[PDB]
Write a protein that binds this ligand. Structure first.
Ligand code: VQB
Lengths: 300, 237
């Protein structure tokens, strides 16, 4: 069980770790988060008390290094930092856990929510969507735009999600215009799965990462990307049976986890009604359709 | 964006554009089967592709063989329309290709957009106008060439005859839409108006009678009466 210690908490802030969150008062004696489950990516995220504008945070995997959070009073945010001195990291951390100045990652043992939300999410892929190669962890915030959004301005600070566009030459084979537009199987299975993503795991990993950035940072381009990747599967007549079954599980847990009060902005009526009720796969997402109907029947 | 009363004059500027109407592409007669069920029989159709500035009409005849063995024909018709429009554009020299295509029904937007991906600089636009181009099959010579076709065929017409020698495009388009609106509201009366005076004839190479300027004012007047009337006969006013 790993640890992300904190130098201090000089400004009042709501801190999230994965789907959990807690309030830290200005200069409260807080020195980090312990007992973080090894084997999954994690996200630690922040909303300042004084400016709920800009939620921001860091995707990381404790297997890839020792990381601590230190406030920067010049740039005005909590920064993730990698300590190369493993003994100095250990020496600093042992002081913090003995003085009990850390919160514990509060994993209920029955609970598989985080695994189910990050099943296919790899750090190596995150780092290709979020380009900043001198760090092993990845910063995301509410304002960052996607490569595709920049097409329709600063590229260093972009989310390089895979561009999906249903009215594009990549999506539409010359001479199969109607066929490819109404049944997107060739775009899903040949262009995207076999060609770009290589397998369904990488596709699902990007889908899950896009949802999580939408949920935790309210990142609009991420929400667009999540819905587009759902719609591409639902609009395909020919989808491997294992992908549909896993998609249903993936979406079920995303909808289960979404804040009840954020469904108004984060869920696109058209995509969900088309996916659950008109698309080829209208019948293939039983768990997702049940939780949607019992939790957000207004949207439908 | 959409074409409407406010940007109406853009139709007559010097940027090449085409209206595309698909309302007569897929045409059926509905009838009873021996078992007393209902079935459709397709008849020949046409795409109505019109340059509103020059009057050039690219009438692609849609022969019933297009539909053989196909499902969801009303949906296919929109894609067949977009395929034939795209083929027409590709067939034209670059300096003749349109800069905008205006579809009269919004359901044509995505089919045409997808077929025109190779032409990113051709704007595909809807319109808020309720244009009467469905009535093009009330023009006798157009209806005749469609019904007589035994294979796919493109036939070229000037729907303005020689009007542009005497009037502007704007005026010619206004006359055309009034004629077609009349024909759509009451075809019999409309056609009676147009052929009442046997001295006025339709030239072999024209679609409409050879009216003098003064006779056109009278004809135009009578068509507006018909439309106002039928609107009374219909709403009781
Ligand atoms: N290494 C550190 C750890 Cl592990 N936790 C907090 N601060 C640290 N920094 C060391 C240099 C200044 C702050």
């Amino acid at each position: 069980m790993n640890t992300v210690p904190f130098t201090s908490a000089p400004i009042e802030v709501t801190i999230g770790i994965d789907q959990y969150s807690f309030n830290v008062k200005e200069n409260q004696p807080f020195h980090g988060i312990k007992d973080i489950p090894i084997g999954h990516v994690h996200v630690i995220h922040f909303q300042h008390a004084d400016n709920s504008s800009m939620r921001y945070g860091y995707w990381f995997d404790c297997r890839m290094g020792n990381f601590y959070i230190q406030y920067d009073p010049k740039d005005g945010l909590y920064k993730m930092m990698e300590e190369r001195d493993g003994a100095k990291f250990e020496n600093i951390v042992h002081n913090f856990k003995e003085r009990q100045m850390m919160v514990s990652y509060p994993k209920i043992d029955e609970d598989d929510t985080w695994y189910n939300l990050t099943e296919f999410v790899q750090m190596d892929k995150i780092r290709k969507i979020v380009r900043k190669d001198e760090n092993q962890f990845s910063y995301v915030d509410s304002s960052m735009t996607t490569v595709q959004e920049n097409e329709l301005s600063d590229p260093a600070h972009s989310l390089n999600y895979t561009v999906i566009n249903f009215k594009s030459r990549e999506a539409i084979r010359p001479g199969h215009e109607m066929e490819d537009f109404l049944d997107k199987s060739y775009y899903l299975n040949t262009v995207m799965l076999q060609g770009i993503f290589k397998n369904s795991s990488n596709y699902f990993g990007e889908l899950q990462f896009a949802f999580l950035n939408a949920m935790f940072f309210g990142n609009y381009g991420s929400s667009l990307q999540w819905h587009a990747m759902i719609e591409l599967i639902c609009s395909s007549a020919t989808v491997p049976k294992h992908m549909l079954d896993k998609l249903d599980e993936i979406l079920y847990y995303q909808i289960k986890t979404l804040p009840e009060q954020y469904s108004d902005i984060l869920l696109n009526e058209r995509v969900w009604n088309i996916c659950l009720y008109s698309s080829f796969q209208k019948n293939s997402l039983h768990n997702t359709e049940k939780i949607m109907e019992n939790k957000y029947p207004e949207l439908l | 964006g959409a074409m409407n009363s406010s940007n109406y004059a853009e139709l007559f500027n010097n940027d090449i554009k085409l209206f595309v109407d698909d309302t007569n592409v897929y045409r059926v007669t509905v009838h009873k089967t021996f078992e007393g069920n209902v079935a459709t029989k397709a008849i020949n159709g046409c795409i109505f592709t019109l340059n509103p500035k020059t009057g050039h009409l690219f009438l692609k005849i849609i022969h019933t063989s297009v539909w053989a063995g196909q499902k969801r024909l009303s949906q296919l018709a929109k894609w067949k329309t977009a395929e034939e429009v795209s083929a027409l554009v590709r067939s034209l020299p670059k300096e003749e290709q349109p800069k905008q295509i205006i579809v009269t029904r919004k359901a044509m937007l995505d089919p045409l957009e997808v077929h025109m991906l190779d032409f990113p600089n051709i704007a595909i636009r809807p319109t808020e106008l309720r244009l009467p181009f469905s009535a093009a099959m009330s023009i006798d010579k157009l209806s005749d060439v469609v019904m007589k076709a035994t294979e796919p065929q493109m036939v070229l017409f000037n729907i303005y005859d020689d009007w542009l020698d005497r009037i502007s495009s704007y005026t010619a388009f206004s006359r055309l839409t009034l004629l077609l609106r009349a024909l759509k509201t009451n075809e019999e009366s409309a056609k009676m108006i147009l052929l009442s005076d046997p001295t006025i004839t339709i030239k072999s190479y024209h679609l409409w009678p050879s009216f003098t300027d003064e006779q056109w004012i009278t004809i135009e007047s009578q068509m507006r009466d018909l439309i106002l009337t039928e609107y009374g006969r219909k709403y009781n006013v």
